[PDB]
Amino acid sequence: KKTIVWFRRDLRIEDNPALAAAAHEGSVFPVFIWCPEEEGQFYPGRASRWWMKQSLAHLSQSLKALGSDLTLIKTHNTISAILDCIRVTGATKVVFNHLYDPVSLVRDHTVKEKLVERGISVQSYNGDLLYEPWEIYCEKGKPFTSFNSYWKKCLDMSIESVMLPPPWRLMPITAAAESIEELGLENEAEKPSNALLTRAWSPGWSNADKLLNEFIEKQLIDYAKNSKKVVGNSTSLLSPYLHFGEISVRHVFQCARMKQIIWARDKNSEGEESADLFLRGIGLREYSRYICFNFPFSHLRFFPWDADVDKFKAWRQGRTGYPLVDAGMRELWATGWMHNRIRVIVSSFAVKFLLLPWKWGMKYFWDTLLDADLECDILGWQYISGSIPDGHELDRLDNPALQGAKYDPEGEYIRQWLPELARLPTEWIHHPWDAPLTVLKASGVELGTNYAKPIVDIDTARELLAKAI
Amino acid sequence: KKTIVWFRRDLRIEDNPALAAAAHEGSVFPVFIWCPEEEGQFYPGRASRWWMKQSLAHLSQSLKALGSDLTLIKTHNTISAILDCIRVTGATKVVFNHLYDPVSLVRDHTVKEKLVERGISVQSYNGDLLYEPWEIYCEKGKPFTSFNSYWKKCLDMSIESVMLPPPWRLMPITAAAESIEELGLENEAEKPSNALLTRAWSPGWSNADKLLNEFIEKQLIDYAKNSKKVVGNSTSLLSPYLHFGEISVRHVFQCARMKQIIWARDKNSEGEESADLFLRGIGLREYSRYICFNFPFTSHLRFFPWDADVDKFKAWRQGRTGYPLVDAGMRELWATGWMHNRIRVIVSSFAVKFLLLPWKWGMKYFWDTLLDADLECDILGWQYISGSIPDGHELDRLDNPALQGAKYDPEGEYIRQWLPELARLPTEWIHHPWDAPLTVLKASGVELGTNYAKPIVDIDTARELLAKAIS
Amino acid sequence: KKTIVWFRRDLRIEDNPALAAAAHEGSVFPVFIWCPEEEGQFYPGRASRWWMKQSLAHLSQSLKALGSDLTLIKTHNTISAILDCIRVTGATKVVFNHLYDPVSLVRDHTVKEKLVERGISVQSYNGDLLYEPWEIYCEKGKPFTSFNSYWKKCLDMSIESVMLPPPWRLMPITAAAESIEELGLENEAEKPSNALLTRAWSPGWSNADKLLNEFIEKQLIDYAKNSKKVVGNSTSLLSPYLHFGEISVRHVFQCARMKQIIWARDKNSEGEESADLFLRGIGLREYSRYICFNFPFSHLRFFPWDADVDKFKAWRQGRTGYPLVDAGMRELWATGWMHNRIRVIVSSFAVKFLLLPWKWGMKYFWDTLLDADLECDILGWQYISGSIPDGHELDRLDNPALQGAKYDPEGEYIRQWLPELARLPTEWIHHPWDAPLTVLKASGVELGTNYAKPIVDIDTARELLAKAI
Amino acid sequence: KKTIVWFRRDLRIEDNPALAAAAHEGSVFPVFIWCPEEEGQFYPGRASRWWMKQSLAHLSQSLKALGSDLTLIKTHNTISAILDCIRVTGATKVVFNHLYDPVSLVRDHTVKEKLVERGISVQSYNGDLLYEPWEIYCEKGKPFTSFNSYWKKCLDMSIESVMLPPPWRLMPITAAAESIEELGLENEAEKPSNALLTRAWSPGWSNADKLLNEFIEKQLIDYAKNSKKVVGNSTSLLSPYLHFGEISVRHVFQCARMKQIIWARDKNSEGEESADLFLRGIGLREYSRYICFNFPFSHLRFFPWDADVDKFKAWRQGRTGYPLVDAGMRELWATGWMHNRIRVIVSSFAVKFLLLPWKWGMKYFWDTLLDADLECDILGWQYISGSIPDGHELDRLDNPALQGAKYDPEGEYIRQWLPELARLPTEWIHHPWDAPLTVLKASGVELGTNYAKPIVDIDTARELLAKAIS
Ligand SMILES: Cc1cc2nc3c(=O)[nH]c(=O)nc-3n(C[C@H](O)[C@H](O)[C@H](O)COP(=O)(O)OP(=O)(O)OC[C@H]3O[C@@H](n4cnc5c(N)ncnc54)[C@H](O)[C@@H]3O)c2cc1C
Ligand SMILES: Cc1cc2nc3c(=O)[nH]c(=O)nc-3n(C[C@H](O)[C@H](O)[C@H](O)COP(=O)(O)OP(=O)(O)OC[C@H]3O[C@@H](n4cnc5c(N)ncnc54)[C@H](O)[C@@H]3O)c2cc1C
Ligand SMILES: Cc1cc2nc3c(=O)[nH]c(=O)nc-3n(C[C@H](O)[C@H](O)[C@H](O)COP(=O)(O)OP(=O)(O)OC[C@H]3O[C@@H](n4cnc5c(N)ncnc54)[C@H](O)[C@@H]3O)c2cc1C
């Protein structure tokens, strides 16, 4: 047999069912079709493309040792490149993994019909998901918009398997079509600025496996009390690796459940909730693929926004005057990642405080986030605008005085990303516009020149939001 | 559908095909039927029974945290106990894993025939092996008889898979049948002495996975450089955990295979070589079940006039033979229930070629003392030492303890730990004090014949008493 | 014998000559006279006073466990308080250590003259200093105007022992006089802002002993290669404890000297150089007291200034547009300490770029430095203004491009204290105004809104100095 | 000036009063005069001489790094070698540190008189003790009888200090006196066996400052609860280093003293008690040189012994059937060191259970111990003998069933030095003879085959000694 594997966002060799199907039957021809025209509005952002350039290099380096290597093709049409690979490789079967974004859903089915009619067999295995969105029903069949009612039933009867990495790898003697090597992801006018994200990130499937041993045996023990704290990479940093499919979610769920069974047996209650807080976070990634599968284009709510370009640039540069918002936008753009509670605040500020279009705030998240996912990002904005009964309503404006006192105690997250407020005490570190002048100047801050004043008064933004509902 | 899971030597949940097959179809019913009379001359030993008692107690607490308890059963007939569990729970399928011991080889295929007549569904799975002995074929007849030619063909193709542990399980209902209250595995007079085995061993599958993680990440880096030595944690110390099936062979194999792949793209020239020896070490266990399958007795039927000396037999157990590697090996074997591989090639070659003692005498001692008392490994180990297999050693091959210790134990640090009386004896004579001059022996406070015993047998006599005893 | 141990800036118990001589004689009455009126402009600043309140509280409970409590007195005249402590205790002798500042020099000699005439014996010992300035002279009595010829001579002689803390203690047990528990150091208008210095500093003498045992066996090995690094606290962080006398320099020298002898015969060509740069640095504290002794006020090289108050606020708040200067002024305000290389840059920028009075720059250093030392700070400004033969010429300015490449490699000091310059490459991390406009957006740095433009051009400031000399 | 330094038992530089004073006055000419014929009975043993050789070359290496060598001299008369060094060097003052052995007490003072009559300046400093034995005066004239009352007197003054190492060194011109390159400390027959002491000891003043800092900062907080134990590094292993004067007694005292002050205000509870035991442990060394100073050569009893040469070989090589005694003898000979609580067990077993002459035990402890202190080893045997008031009477001995139940619980100390008793339960581990026959067959213990039977009954030693105490 001659099989052609099609890597998309399953950039790994471990537990790859499409790759395990190959190399178990005949020869393998790895290929990566990169068609930017067919991506549409879902084109990968600036930082998301940088992770793709490094992961594909780490992938091609991995496949180069197994026996074959990793063909990259930039084409104007995916089917035009797939049918052209079969021309030079003489393959009789093509295999790939599942992707549930709106562009790949209609493309996986179109690629099927075009070459299955031609006597060439296809097969699409389960990838990046523990449960397919067509494997669960409420007995009846109603969709569980309730994540609580969703994940409560997913914990019942797991029936899958964990695969292996292929020991060997065979490749036919072929030619080339239309081939490329490495271009179309990083712009020369910003490569030096993009080469600085390596300070806190290292793309690759093997580096992802090092992270699992760094988090399971050492950091998952007290994850329930660290995830609440926002200052420190307190969580697992597995979002960029899981999006690009560098870690199989089977492994992320198996070894985490393995720790839960040991802690549930050792009477340990601190680790039990730590495993619950992490496994029920893994289910949210599965919940995002379930909603986006039967609720694509939910969020059909177009109320009078306030398309102010200048007020949007201050939200990107962290000049909104709010400490917890400006620090989050400072962390997002410095490391390409931010905590979940930070995203909740900086996104709510973009729609509830500034009335900017939610698409504008998402297009910036889609561009600068290293973990820029499609199902998870949309799911986060639905949690903000009030599209799920298990999320905060659009009308509420959380007071930063108590909001910072929950996720960022002692104000150590602002004093790390906003060094100008390093002497402002924790009593006013989340809201300098409430402290008297006798303690503001004592802290060294001068609201106006030393630190930006609040861009929008919260007292006037509460009623003005309810003034249009 | 109610399904009875029959635990035997697969005391684990991570990759248990029989346990994963059940608990997914419907209900589950764990049971450990302990029938000592059906196991003949190779009834589980003394220390190995102690390990089994602690693992079963840990297995009981592990399963009770998932959903169902564990039915500990000690009856007079195993098949009678299986038929008793079917009627009390209403089960319809009996599921267990594969075992290749001659006792279970003839009764596992008997339980199937007994239950097919009654209509009870049965299905066996490969639990503690990656290549079953009937899966490797050729185009001719017989196996390979050489491990090099056997393991060369196993590395050609590979189709494995790792199963997941179920987070939920369901008990059946009503009354229980004959139930054993965890009894028989220990004798009242030798219980405090068996508790001393906890100093270097913590049985159970939970500590088994942590050791596999510790060895792969922090010790497989230089396994090829330490496995050839004896001192300290030279190897992985996974034999007692792999014998009772607490870690699946695939989980141990793939962890060193995954680490070997990363040690290739990073051009770790000596890294992937360390995984080659460890994986081939696992292959020796695979090759043990191939010989034991085709040759199902206990290529080893050479019993000639032995020196049935019970006085020289107790001097070999307690480690008082004048040979440091032999004495220190028998000192660690009885104090920790374990010993290095190269030392087992020494203490047993000394038992059959230096003392002319029966090989069944030393093998019965390994059965009671070794926690990793593997039937398939304890047979292949003694066959490799004698001239039974052309895999390595012959019958008329003796090794000088001088070049033997300096090859597997430099600086003599292994003897000084288990023989304090030879602490100030230099490494040049630490492995053979009799060949050292009296000017250094008294300076090293040895004094043969009072503190450390003189060599019980001469190296030249054992060669002249054996070459003239073969015809 | 009833003795009075006048604690001043010797806030320790171990290696205390005046405390040991008074203990091994008879009774001990420790007292601390705090007269802010006798202090001229050398009155302790905001940060330096906070360190005094913590060390004195630690000193109070320290002696409280040995046998005698600590007495703090805030009076109008020090001699009036000393005469009061004598008439309430009957102490026939008053002992103290040495202080070489101009105010405390004429005071100790006035205290001796006023107490000797009353029949009360006085005794002074060497404290907080290896060898006094009146003990180092060649065959000629010429004071060493150069430091290279200074410390090279201090190593050719060594005669000073080290003593242990007193074992026992007892009190003359008599009524007290005017007993000012704790007044003057901290005002309530800035108490919470001052309490935030506990993040990176823990004042006390036992914490100083905790600091040495960590710096010797762990950080002194490669001190020569870490002193060239500005990022982080690469040095020892011993200046605050040495200024307040919380640990004697004899123990600081003896621990580093024996480590050098250990590395001497060990063929350690890297440990000797590390012990050298630390001991040569200890000599700078020794050299500061030498110039402060027979050179009262040289630093009288004044030149016309441009005292711009608005340009002085930007120098404090770090709004000067220079990344290496603003990052240092942020660290000076956040933690009250900065590296020696940073102090050279931020002080030269105040006098050589903005043309601000050197006293104004010192008035801010003296107020915000936890290690605010009179002899060390003046010696620092003498090194910048060009008042030393082996210093820096006042007529020349260093290019921040090559300046950052010398003391801040990899560019990690700006990315920590100025998070807006995170993705700005090292090629322009020290000077964003030289970078092209194409990379100023790739680095997400808009000068008019993100990080302010340089307030004064470098080439103009270099010629403006030559325009008035 | 030019001063000659005489290193004898002060092989250190951190705090050496005779070395730092000689460095300031002028030139430094370090000499190490040995002369075994003047030692006689107090000649260092086999293992103790090995430490002296390794610590000598290491101290000679550290001296040359400063600027002055170390002249090693082996002579027949120590005074003839001192005068030979003065003429070839031209020195004026001869300096050295104090010692408190009967040899040096009459030798150093003889050096003083013969060099004073010739016009050579001499000055001896204190560098081996906190308070010198003549600085303490008690009652009216009885030099105190016990230690618990002696050390209370030392805790009522304390005018100590410490000194710094001198970075400068300069040796004069020509010399070449009657110095040898290597003496006769090691014999070729016992050299490879002596090299096996490096695995447990790294002698020298440089390493001495390492485990000193390691002990005070790490394993001192819980010294009050680990001093009674024996397993592992229970104590500080500072006995051999303080014997050769590689660490100043003031630095050892003032380090644990500084931790007690910090643990006082913080109220560490166990911290103050651990210092109160370690400092009073140093006080026993202070009392060792005190009782040995006023008394010559309280330990002179020649009652009928049992001079059995075969019973001496069993107690020496650890074959007496007593695991707590046999394991100690196998440690004392393997590592050249043993815990203090083991010494009162292996030495009391030799003089009471076996009735062997105590000189046979003291001669063996002098050869195999690296910390062979003349002033301290004698006091240890006096504690075993019925001599010291606060000590063991001659007719007292404890059952090992209670010794291990308090000083060595869990029996992990025996299973390391006696592997043949590993599976023996921790109850009968210190006395296998009293164990039932079922546990002995189960624990592989065959008293008389693999492990030796008790060489002497405990009830016999009590009844045999009663007839001799009349
Ligand atoms: C507005 C908004 C936008 C978001 N955009 C993304 C995105 O683009 N990509 C992304 O991976 N996550 C996104 N999330 C989820 C969340 O920000 C990250 O999953 C998490 O904060 C970082 O992962 P971690 O490994 O550090 O933490 P952990 O909590 O340890 O991550 C657990 C894993 O489970 C999944 N997961 C965790 N939380 C969620 C969630 N809320 N929704 C979906 N899956 C989840 C991810 O695979 C994640 O790696 C978004 C959340 C919000 C509120
Ligand atoms: C006379 C004799 C008797 C032996 N009896 C046993 C026995 O009863 N039980 C037992 O498990 N091993 C036995 N062996 C093999 C060998 O002693 C052990 O495998 C090894 O010493 C312990 O392996 P480890 O887990 O400590 O380390 P590693 O060697 O790192 O473990 C590798 C694993 O592979 C297998 N393995 C490794 N070497 C061999 C080998 N030579 N033969 C077979 N399998 C091997 C084992 O499952 C082992 O756990 C015997 C060898 C000899 C010479
Ligand atoms: C403008 C300016 C102002 C300064 N103001 C002070 C001050 O107020 N207080 C202060 O203690 N030091 C001052 N210094 C000296 C120097 O900044 C600090 O000694 C040092 O940076 C503190 O870090 P450290 O103690 O970890 O350094 P290390 O080098 O690790 O410590 C060496 C020690 O030696 C002394 N020392 C080292 N370098 C110098 C130096 N250049 N001048 C004087 N003493 C030195 C200090 O006691 C210091 O603690 C100043 C230097 C300059 C250029």
Shortest Cα–Cα distance, B279 to chain A (Å): 13
Judged by 3 or more CB pairs under 8 A, whether A touches D is no
Question: Could you give the CA distance from residue A466 to residue A463 in angstroms, rounded to a whole number?
Answer: 5
Shortest Cα–Cα distance, A190 to chain C (Å): 5
Residue C193 is nearest to which of A313, A317, A439, comparing CB atoms? Answer: A439
Q: Does D65 touch chain C (CB under 8 A)?
A: yes
Residues contacting B271, CB < 8 A, separation 6+: B221, B259, B260, B263
Question: Could you give the CA distance from residue B244 to residue B371 in angstroms, rounded to a whole number?
Answer: 10
Q: Dig out the tokens for C270 from the structure.
A: 């890297």
Q: Give the ligand at the shortest distance from the Cα of B284.
A: 2
Question: Could you give the CA distance from residue C341 to residue C319 in angstroms, rounded to a whole number?
Answer: 19
**Residue A468: how many CB atoms within 10 A of its CB?**
8
Residue C163 is nearest to which of D161, D213, D262, comparing CB atoms? Answer: D161
Closest CA to B49 of B448, B403, B367: B367
Residues contacting D298, CB < 8 A, separation 6+: D291, D382, D387, D388
Question: Could you give the CA distance from residue C28 to residue C6 in angstroms, rounded to a whole number?
Answer: 10
The last residues before gaps in chain B (C-N over 2.5 Å) are: 178, 298
Closest CA to B401 of B468, B446, B455: B455
Three-state secondary structure string covering D75-95: CCCHHHHHHHHHHHHCCCEEE
CA-nearest residue of chain B to A250? Answer: B164
Cα of B169 from ligand 1 centre, angstroms? 31
Question: Could you give the CA distance from residue A72 to residue A79 in angstroms, rounded to a whole number?
Answer: 14
CA-nearest residue of chain C to A193? Answer: C423
Residue C449 is nearest to which of A319, A427, A438, comparing CB atoms? Answer: A319
Query: Do D260 and C65 meet the contact criterion of CB atoms below 8 Å apart?
Result: no
Query: Do D126 and D17 meet the contact criterion of CB atoms below 8 Å apart?
Result: yes
**Residue C464: how many CB atoms within 10 A of its CB?**
15
Residues contacting B444, CB < 8 A, separation 6+: B422, B424, B425, B426, B429, B436, D192, D193
Query: Which ligand 3 atom minimizes the distance to the CA of C383?
Result: 53
Q: Does B441 touch chain D (CB under 8 A)?
A: no
- What's the length of chain D? 470
Residue nearest to atom 5 of ligand 2 (CA): B378
Residues contacting D259, CB < 8 A, separation 6+: D216, D220, D271, D275
Experimental method: X-ray
Q: B71-73 and B29-33: which strand pairing? A: parallel
Cα of A376 from ligand 1 centre, angstroms? 7
Report the amino acid identity of residue C286. Answer: E
Q: Chain A to chain B, count of Cβ pairs less than 8 Å apart?
A: 72
Q: Is B374 in the pocket of ligand 2 (CB under 6 A)?
A: yes
Residue D265 is nearest to which of C62, C163, C265, comparing CB atoms? Answer: C62
Question: Could you give the CA distance from residue C58 to residue C208 in angstroms, rounded to a whole number?
Answer: 12
Q: Is B237 in the pocket of ligand 2 (CB under 6 A)?
A: yes
SS3 assignment, position A37: helix
Question: Could you give the CA distance from residue B43 to residue B37 in angstroms, rounded to a whole number?
Answer: 8
Residues contacting A191, CB < 8 A, separation 6+: none
Question: Could you give the CA distance from residue A279 to residue A300 in angstroms, rounded to a whole number?
Answer: 31
C242 assigned to a ligand binding site = no
DSSP state of A454: P
If you search the block for the tokens 């790939």, which residue do you land on? A96
Residues contacting C136, CB < 8 A, separation 6+: C144, C150, C153, C154, C157, C290
Q: What residue ranges in B55-208 does DSSP mark as E strands?
A: 71-73, 93-97, 121-125
Report the amino acid identity of residue C6. Answer: W
Residue nearest to atom 17 of ligand 2 (CA): B341
Cα of B207 from ligand 2 centre, angstroms? 19
Query: Do C55 and C203 meet the contact criterion of CB atoms below 8 Å apart?
Result: yes
If you search the block for the tokens 């000017």, which residue do you land on? B439
Shortest Cα–Cα distance, A253 to chain B (Å): 10
Q: Give the ligand at the shortest distance from the Cα of A208.
A: 1
* CA C48, chain centre distance (Å): 9
Question: Could you give the CA distance from residue B238 to residue B211 in angstroms, rounded to a whole number?
Answer: 8
Q: Does B167 touch chain A (CB under 8 A)?
A: yes
Query: Do C260 and C271 meet the contact criterion of CB atoms below 8 Å apart?
Result: yes
H/E run at residue A2: strand A2-6
**What's the resolution in A?**
3.2
Sheet with C93-96: strands ordered across: C71-73, C27-33, C2-6, C93-96, C121-124
- Best interface-test mutation with C: which of A312, A315, A420 has the largest number of C CBs within 10 A? A420
* Ligand 1 site, CB within 6 A: A 235-239, 242-243, 278, 281-282, 284-285, 288, 339-340, 343-344, 347, 369, 371-373, 376-377, 379-381, 383
Closest CA to D381 of D452, D465, D445, D291: D291
Closest CA to C151 of C289, C255, C269, C248: C289
Query: Do A370 and A337 meet the contact criterion of CB atoms below 8 Å apart?
Result: yes
C298 assigned to a ligand binding site = no
Q: Dig out the tokens for B245 from the structure.
A: 């099936």
Q: Does B254 touch chain A (CB under 8 A)?
A: yes
Question: Could you give the CA distance from residue D333 to residue A379 in angstroms, rounded to a whole number?
Answer: 73
Output the DSSP codes for A218-272.
TTGGGHHHHSS--SSS-S---HHHHHTTSS-HHHHHHHHHHHHHHHHHTT-SHHH
Subunit contact B159:A206, Cβ cutoff 8 A? no
H/E run at residue A94: strand A93-97
User: Could you give phi then psi for residue C96, rounded to 5 degrees?
Assistant: -165, 175
If you search the block for the tokens 């009293």, which residue do you land on? D434
A237 assigned to a ligand binding site = yes
Question: Could you give the CA distance from residue C166 to residue C22 in angstroms, rounded to a whole number?
Answer: 9
Q: What angle do CA C205, C209, C215 make, to 5 degrees?
A: 135
User: Could you give phi then psi for residue A32, rounded to 5 degrees?
Assistant: -130, 100
Question: Could you give the CA distance from residue D411 to residue D430 in angstroms, rounded to a whole number?
Answer: 8
Query: Which ligand 2 atom minimizes the distance to the CA of B288?
Result: 43
Residues contacting C121, CB < 8 A, separation 6+: C92, C93, C94, C115
Query: Do D307 and D357 meet the contact criterion of CB atoms below 8 Å apart?
Result: yes
SS3 assignment, position D241: helix
Shortest Cα–Cα distance, D234 to chain B (Å): 19
Burial class (CB in 10 A: 0-12, 13-18, 19+), A118: exposed
Judged by 3 or more CB pairs under 8 A, whether C touches B is no
Question: Could you give the CA distance from residue C135 to residue C132 in angstroms, rounded to a whole number?
Answer: 6
Closest CA to C233 of C323, C326, C325, C337: C337
Question: Could you give the CA distance from residue C335 to residue C342 in angstroms, rounded to a whole number?
Answer: 14
Closest CA to C135 of C110, C159, C103: C159
Sheet with B71-73: strands ordered across: B71-73, B29-33, B3-6, B93-97, B121-125
Question: Could you give the CA distance from residue D372 to residue D363 in angstroms, rounded to a whole number?
Answer: 10
- Start-to-end Cα distance in chain B: 64
Question: Could you give the CA distance from residue C4 to residue B289 in angstroms, rounded to a whole number?
Answer: 89
Q: Dig out the tokens for C101 from the structure.
A: 């500042």
Subunit contact D319:B443, Cβ cutoff 8 A? no
Q: Does A333 touch chain C (CB under 8 A)?
A: yes
**Residue D270: how many CB atoms within 10 A of its CB?**
13
Q: Dig out the tokens for C43 from the structure.
A: 């009155």
Q: Give the ligand at the shortest distance from the Cα of A351.
A: 1
Longest dimension (CA), chain A: 81
B239 assigned to a ligand binding site = yes
Helices B78-89 + B102-117 axis angle, to 10: 40
Query: Do C229 and C409 meet the contact criterion of CB atoms below 8 Å apart?
Result: yes
Handedness of CA A164, A168, A174, A179 (dihedral sign): positive
Q: Which residues of A touch B14 (CB under 8 A)?
A: 258
Give chains near A: 3+ CB pairs under 8 A. B, C
Cα distances from B470 to residues B354, B463, B464, B465, C128, in angstroms, run: 15, 11, 11, 9, 90
Residue B160 is nearest to which of A66, A164, A261, comparing CB atoms? Answer: A164
Query: Do C336 and C243 meet the contact criterion of CB atoms below 8 Å apart?
Result: no
Q: Does C153 touch chain D (CB under 8 A)?
A: no
Q: Give the ligand at the shortest distance from the Cα of C369.
A: 3
Cα distances from D70 to residues A234, D63, D65, D181, in angstroms, run: 60, 7, 11, 10
Question: Could you give the CA distance from residue C17 to residue D70 in angstroms, rounded to a whole number?
Answer: 35
Cα of A349 from ligand 1 centre, angstroms? 19
The last residues before gaps in chain D (C-N over 2.5 Å) are: 178, 297
Q: What angle do CA C462, C464, C465 make, to 5 degrees?
A: 70
* CA A418, chain centre distance (Å): 26
Three-state secondary structure string covering chain C: CEEEEECCCCCCCCCCHHHHHHHCCCEEEEEEECCCCCCCCCCCCHHHHHHHHHHHHHHHHHHHHHCCCCEEECCCCHHHHHHHHHHCCCCCEEEECCCCCHHHHHHHHHHHHHHHCCCCEEEECCCCCCCCHHHCCCCCCCCCCCCHHHHHHHCCCCCCCECCCCCCCCCCCCCCCCCCCCCCCCCHHHHHHHHHHHCCCCCCHHHHHHHHHHHHHHHCCCHHHHCCCCCCCCCCCCHHHHHCCCCCHHHHHHHHHHHHHHHHHCCCHHHHHHHHHHHHHHHHHHHHHHHHHHCCCCCCCCCCCCCCHHHHHHHHHCCCCCHHHHHHHHHHHHCCCCCHHHHHHHHHHHHHHCCCCHHHHHHHHHHHCCCCCHHHHHHHHHHHHCCCCCCCCCCCCCCHHHHHHHHCHHHCCHHHHCHHHCCCCCCCCCCCCCCCHHHHHHCCCCCCCCCCCCCCCHHHHHHHHHCCC
CA-nearest residue of chain B to A252? Answer: B164
- What's the length of chain A? 469
The last residues before gaps in chain C (C-N over 2.5 Å) are: 178, 297
DSSP state of A200: T
Indicate the Cα dihedral angle A70, A72, A73, A78, nearest 10°. Answer: 60
If you search the block for the tokens 């297009």, which residue do you land on? A363
Subunit contact B424:D193, Cβ cutoff 8 A? yes
Closest CA to C351 of C341, C361, C340: C361
Query: Do C12 and C245 meet the contact criterion of CB atoms below 8 Å apart?
Result: yes
Q: Assign 3-state DSSP to chain D and report helix, strand, coil percentages, each to 5.
A: 50, 5, 45
Question: Could you give the CA distance from residue B219 to residue B212 in angstroms, rounded to a whole number?
Answer: 10
